[PDB]
Amino acid sequence: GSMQSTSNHLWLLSDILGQGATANVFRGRHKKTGDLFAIKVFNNRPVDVQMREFEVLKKLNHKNIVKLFAIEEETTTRHKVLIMEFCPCGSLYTVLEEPSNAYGLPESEFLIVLRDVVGGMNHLRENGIVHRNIKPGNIMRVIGEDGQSVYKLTDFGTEEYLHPDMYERVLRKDHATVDLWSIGVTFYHAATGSLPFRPFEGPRRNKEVMYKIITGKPSGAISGVQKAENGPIDWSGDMPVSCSLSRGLQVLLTPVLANILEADQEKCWGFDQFFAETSDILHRMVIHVFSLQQMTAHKIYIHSYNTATIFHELVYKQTKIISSNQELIYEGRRLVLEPGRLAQHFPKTTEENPIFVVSREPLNTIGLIYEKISLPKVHPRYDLDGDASMAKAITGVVCYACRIASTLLLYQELMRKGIRWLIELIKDDYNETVHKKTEVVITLDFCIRNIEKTVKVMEISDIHTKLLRLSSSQGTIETSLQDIDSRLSPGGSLADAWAHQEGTHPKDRNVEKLQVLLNCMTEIYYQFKKDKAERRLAYNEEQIHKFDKQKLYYHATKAMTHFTDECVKKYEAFLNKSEEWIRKMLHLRKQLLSLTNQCFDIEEEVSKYQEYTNELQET
Amino acid sequence: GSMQSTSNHLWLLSDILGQGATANVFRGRHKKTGDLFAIKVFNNRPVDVQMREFEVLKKLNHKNIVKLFAIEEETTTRHKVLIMEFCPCGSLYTVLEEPSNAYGLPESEFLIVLRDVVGGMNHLRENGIVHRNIKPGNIMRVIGEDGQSVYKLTDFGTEEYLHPDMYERVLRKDHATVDLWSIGVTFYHAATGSLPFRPFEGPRRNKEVMYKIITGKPSGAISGVQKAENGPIDWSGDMPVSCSLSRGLQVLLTPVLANILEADQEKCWGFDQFFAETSDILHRMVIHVFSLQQMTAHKIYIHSYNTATIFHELVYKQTKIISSNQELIYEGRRLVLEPGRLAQHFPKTTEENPIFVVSREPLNTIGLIYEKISLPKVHPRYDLDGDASMAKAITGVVCYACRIASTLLLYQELMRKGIRWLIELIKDDYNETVHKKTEVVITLDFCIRNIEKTVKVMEISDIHTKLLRLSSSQGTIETSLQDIDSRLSPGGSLADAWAHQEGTHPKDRNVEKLQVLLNCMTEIYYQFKKDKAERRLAYNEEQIHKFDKQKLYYHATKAMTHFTDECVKKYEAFLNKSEEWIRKMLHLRKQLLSLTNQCFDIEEEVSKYQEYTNELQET
Numbered sequence A, B: 001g002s003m004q005s006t007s008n009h010l011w012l013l014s015d016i017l018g019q020g021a022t023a024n025v026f027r028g029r030h031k032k033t034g035d036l037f038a039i040k041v042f043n044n045r046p047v048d049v050q051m052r053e054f055e056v057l058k059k060l061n062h063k064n065i066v067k068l069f070a071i072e073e074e075t076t077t078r079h080k081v082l083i084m085e086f087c088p089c090g091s092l093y094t095v096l097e098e099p100s101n102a103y104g105l106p107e108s109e110f111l112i113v114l115r116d117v118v119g120g121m122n123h124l125r126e127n128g129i130v131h132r133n134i135k136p137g138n139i140m141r142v143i144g145e146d147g148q149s150v151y152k153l154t155d156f157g158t159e160e161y162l163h164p165d166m167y168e169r170v171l172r173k174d175h176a177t178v179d180l181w182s183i184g185v186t187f188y189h190a191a192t193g194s195l196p197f198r199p200f201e202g203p204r205r206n207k208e209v210m211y212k213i214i215t216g217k218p219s220g221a222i223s224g225v226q227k228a229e230n231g232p233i234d235w236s237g238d239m240p241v242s243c244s245l246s247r248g249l250q251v252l253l254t255p256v257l258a259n260i261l262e263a264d265q266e267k268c269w270g271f272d273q274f275f276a277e278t279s280d281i282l283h284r285m286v287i288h289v290f291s292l293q294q295m296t297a298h299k300i301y302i303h304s305y306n307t308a309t310i311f312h313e314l315v316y317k318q319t320k321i322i323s324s325n326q327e328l329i330y331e332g333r334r335l336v337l338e339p340g341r342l343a344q345h346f347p348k349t350t351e352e353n354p355i356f357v358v359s360r361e362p363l364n365t366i367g368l369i370y371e372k373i374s375l376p377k378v379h380p381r382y383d384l385d386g387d388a389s390m391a392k393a394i395t396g397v398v399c400y401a402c403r404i405a406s407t408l409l410l411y412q413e414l415m416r417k418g419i420r421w422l423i424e425l426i427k428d429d430y431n432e433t434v435h436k437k438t439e440v441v442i443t444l445d446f447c448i449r450n451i452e453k454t455v456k457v458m459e460i461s462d463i464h465t466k467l468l469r470l471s472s473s474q475g476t477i478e479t480s481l482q483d484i485d486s487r488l489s490p491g492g493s494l495a496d497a498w499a500h501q502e503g504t505h506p507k508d509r510n511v512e513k514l515q516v517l518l519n520c521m522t523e524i525y526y527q528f529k530k531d532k533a534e535r536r537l538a539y540n541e542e543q544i545h546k547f548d549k550q551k552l553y554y555h556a557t558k559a560m561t562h563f564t565d566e567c568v569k570k571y572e573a574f575l576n577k578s579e580e581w582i583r584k585m586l587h588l589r590k591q592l593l594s595l596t597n598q599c600f601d602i603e604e605e606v607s608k609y610q611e612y613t614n615e616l617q618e619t
């Protein structure tokens, strides 16, 4: 294949990375080093209006802006080319096309996108530039030297991302907020895998319905979807259930989207507010909490300099457990946080190693709430464009099922761990009061006798009668403690055994079994992606394509069956069993507490007769 | 490209999987389904001597034997082809060629290899078959439905793997043990990434030196390496330091290899013993233990039905901490194992969540012992065969550095966790004795007074003088406890802070930084693998190959520098700091114990004068 060139670079025309009305982008090399670069070639002012604007871009130095290195002349034409930083990974679009991102980015990746888009935007503004159309295709991805994605803006200076005024397309007036809109759509797309505003069929098919959805949108709504043809619009101010972002993050993100997806730019946020509100999210650290009675994991987004008081409030918001009722467990022991303890001084947590919260007050066992998504039907009609689109969708469904399977397993593993720890904690309490009791018996049983000690050496009868009631009261405690110990023992009604008998375990390798099926589906999907780009298949490759179409469905059905019949069913049995075990536990702790307070009441009444034994003497 | 065929199958001649003197193996498809199969075509008794042997193989049904499905006639020739199970992953050879396996398989994979080879071998024997030459190329890998490798034997009925009698090449006499030899070599290769018997240069280059090494091999040795030309042989009965297998596994594997790599078949093990000894390994479960004072992780290979007594003995073997001195910690709390408790009833562990062992007796802080491996020099001479070989080696070195970096980080993370837990445990002890003390003060300070109580109501002077010494003795305890509490406090000499200040942390992302560099090296390695197979490169591809040769070295140097300067240096500082913190801790626990025993001594002497207060009375 032929290639163009300049003094320092050359590039195959086959290795094209991007195509715009203004220019083409190819992947090329430095002739002398061999290093990869993106070559931007313009097809066609006044002459120096661009040479100037080329210069300003060369000056821009920021982590979140794709770098413009040099401006050279192509060899065959004297036309200007731009040598720009090559981004091997591609764009946010590339990422969002992965079947595993069909329902939104993983939370960690979403946060990098949020951070980098925001930092890039701000840098432009800081230099006076406006990037009229941000979109996943504009947002380039590179692997940072620490293995983390870095997102970088390029091509500054589409329908689904255009503002309602921009979607109409008068010069966009003249002076921005319009940029916040495509940012809003972009962030929603990244969070959910879908566009927020969706006419039935496609936006392009119904340009008019799309405009109606966006202008007639009620304030606060962040999405509007038409599910049937010519049907009404389902509005929402919330993220879809299928979104993977934590409730903690959803609660912060939602208001931002709502306030930058606002039609009347009168009430749009403006950049500075947007920058403040997004930075406030980005600057928060995350503390992982697991609600043991609700069977729910939580991410608490809290500032380094925030107190435990604020932490408790944030936990109440997600659990509805008031601060005073929040009992914390971490790495096998109670965690007691002083009110003014800064979050940066909290113990380190992960999703696998969270702080557990428990309450002495009854709570509904919730578990994981997720979307029930079935396989789309597979259209038997051979079609390279349709099949690749379908392959993506059905693989996307199985990926989601796999992510849920993983979360379900995690929830069960955390449950088992928290329960194990809580039982040991309760046992400490049982042992703490049992010492306290035996400790007061030793003085009570001693002082009850010390009275008669003097008699052998007229009212005392009134002292013995009230006291012998205490020993009798202590007999009632003994038998009740023996009953609690009995329940905490291996055969006890608060036994652990069921937790190892119910649900699913790592050794079951359910996640891995599903991943294997997913991997088969993903290979076929990518091949279909190849088959689409190649317009026609030869007879053999055609049949093989049709065979694997059936194989896709076969793999998907097998996965879903395993997921529902094995993963979900056993999870729901474990959950139902947990719910009863929780109920018993609360009842036991409540009875134990009562026995403990009785031990304190008895102890102090005995600490009163200890002195009343000795009278004043004549001397 | 042309393809051969049969009624049911067809295959490109380009898609060849394997080549033997007897037959070729291609990757083909069922014509009607499209399903992949291995087609084995024979090039050439008597006629039915093979039709019979083909039939016996068709009957063989085992997980660890590659399946023979059918025997069909090719279309152009009436020649017999075998349709066999296609193994998408390839062979153990394929696996061992990966740069990340240059120093042996990961322990988990090695165990699957051990299991599957053994199960396959046994199945053959159970049917009377002998597989004269097992080798990594004979051992096929498939992904099991649970995502785990399954290894399968094929091609039954090389130099480095041949027995000394076989290496000579008289009909191999007639009747096996000879098979155990290539099994021995294979397992050693899998464990270490290298052949056990290595003349200088290559075995093929020095067929004579190789035979000398193997026959003149002293008993017990499992390897023999000639490091210089015409130089002596370094024998070893142990695994190389660079081996990744745990000491626990190494201790069991080594004797097996030594006894099946035995020259004189007089003293070779024989199959049944081999099957017993290997099964005994495969049937053991693993308990992860971390020695906190030695800074060493351990895998304890123990039977389900073994007792804690046996467990302690196994731990002593790897740590040299006698049973009685072994103090166990798990998930933040002491673990007390009853002597007869079966290992299957132990708490579940992983490398990340081990049982910690500590001792009140001094131990040398060891840390991780690993091989210091430097980069090979890169030969500037362009050579497709040499460069691909070199690329593999240098990438192999960086992978090893990456695995070590990971283990070093883990060791530090475990240290930090164990220390954190131990400090809380010591604090419990401090609080347990402090209650005990105040508890006896309340009776001592009471009974010291109860004496004078009677006087106000001739020898007592002898009672007060011994007793006032006890209160004085209790004053000496109080001040000593206040000194221990002081050390356990945030400013205390047993502070935790250094552990968060020294070494490296997950947030440093050192492992990930190295992985990125490794990924760049691995892409180039695979391209070189492609460049080798293609005999010559065009001018451009040639230069690019030479450029990336320099890039390989650049990436490797950067990685090693980061590893030594950042990972290793900070690890060694953390280790040195740990060593002193351990020393203090032992001293503190020793002083605390002493204060605790004094609290018991005082307590019982006071529990004697409690009754001696009251005399017999006339009545």
Ligand SMILES: O=C(NCCCNc1nc(Nc2cccc(CN3CCOCC3)c2)ncc1C1CC1)C1CCC1
Binding pocket: A017, A018, A019, A020, A023, A024, A025, A027, A038, A066, A084, A085, A086, A087, A088, A089, A090, A091, A094, A137, A138, A140, A154, A155
């Ligand atoms: O830049 C634009 N649009 C989208 C981005 C095309 N640009 C790039 N793509 C890339 N990389 C890239 C683009 C698309 C796909 C991929 C992934 N491919 C996988 C297969 O092997 C080739 C890379 C990589 N790097 C840099 C750039 C230019 C300098 C900013 C403007 C619209 C036409 C110009």
Ligand SMILES: O=C(NCCCNc1nc(Nc2cccc(CN3CCOCC3)c2)ncc1C1CC1)C1CCC1
Binding pocket: B017, B018, B019, B020, B023, B024, B025, B027, B038, B066, B084, B085, B086, B087, B088, B089, B090, B091, B094, B137, B138, B140, B154, B155
């Ligand atoms: O079987 C023999 N030698 C080595 C194994 C060749 N056989 C196979 N290879 C495979 N798979 C395989 C072999 C080599 C490489 C690979 C990996 N390739 C990666 C690139 O895409 C094609 C597969 C896969 N499957 C089955 C078989 C035969 C039925 C037992 C005997 C020696 C010649 C016959």
